[PDB]
């Protein structure tokens, strides 16, 4: 289930973080707008960019803690509050989270592994909704 999925992603987090984030950028190429230095690079080059590898693991480090503190795929309102505030997110929509979660779900569904894809769908939908209540456009 969802709890074992957090343990699975954490056991190889930098490769899952990178492969899921690349799935996202490849599904939603216009999403590179928010990351201008990622444009004009393949997946093998992005992996070679220090901040790509660092930022994508740190995103995933956070997402996995929020997942871990969730109950029944419902994040802590305190965790949506932290996210909306961030600093980087000054410019960021719930749309961009929904997109990342559509990418994450398809990646899970397409893998040979027993990921609880429906739970991740639920989680993203619920994180979006909590970000929308904590004051994200």
Ligand X SMILES: O=[N+]([O-])c1ccc(O)cc1
**97 annotated to bind ligand:** yes
Nearest to ligand X of 85, 114 (CB atom): 85
* Residue 119 interacts with ligand X (CB under 6 A): yes or no: no
String marking each residue 72-91 x if it binds ligand FDE according to CB under 6 A: ----------------x---
Instruction: Find all residues with CB under 8 Å of 32, minimum gap 6, and list them.
Output: 25, 38, 39
**87 annotated to bind ligand:** no
**61 annotated to bind ligand:** no
Q: By CB under 6 A, which span of 50-58, 101-109, 113-121, 123-131 interacts with ligand X?
A: 50-58
Nearest to ligand X of 101, 115 (CB atom): 101
């Amino acid at each position: 289930g969802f709890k074992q999925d957090i343990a699975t992603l954490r056991g190889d987090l930098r490769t899952y973080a990178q492969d899921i984030f690349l799935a996202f950028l490849n599904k939603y190429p216009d999403e590179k707008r928010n990351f201008k230095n990622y444009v004009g690079k393949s997946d093998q080059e992005l992996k070679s960019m220090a901040k790509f590898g660092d930022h994508t693991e740190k995103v995933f480090n956070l997402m996995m803690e929020v997942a871990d503190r969730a109950t029944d795929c419902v994040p802590l309102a305190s965790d949506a509050s932290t996210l909306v505030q961030m600093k980087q997110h000054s410019g960021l929509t719930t749309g961009n989270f929904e997109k990342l979660f559509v990418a994450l779900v398809e990646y899970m569904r397409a893998s040979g592994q027993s990921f609880d894809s429906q739970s991740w769908d639920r989680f993203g939908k619920n994180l979006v909704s909590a970000l929308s209540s904590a004051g994200m456009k």
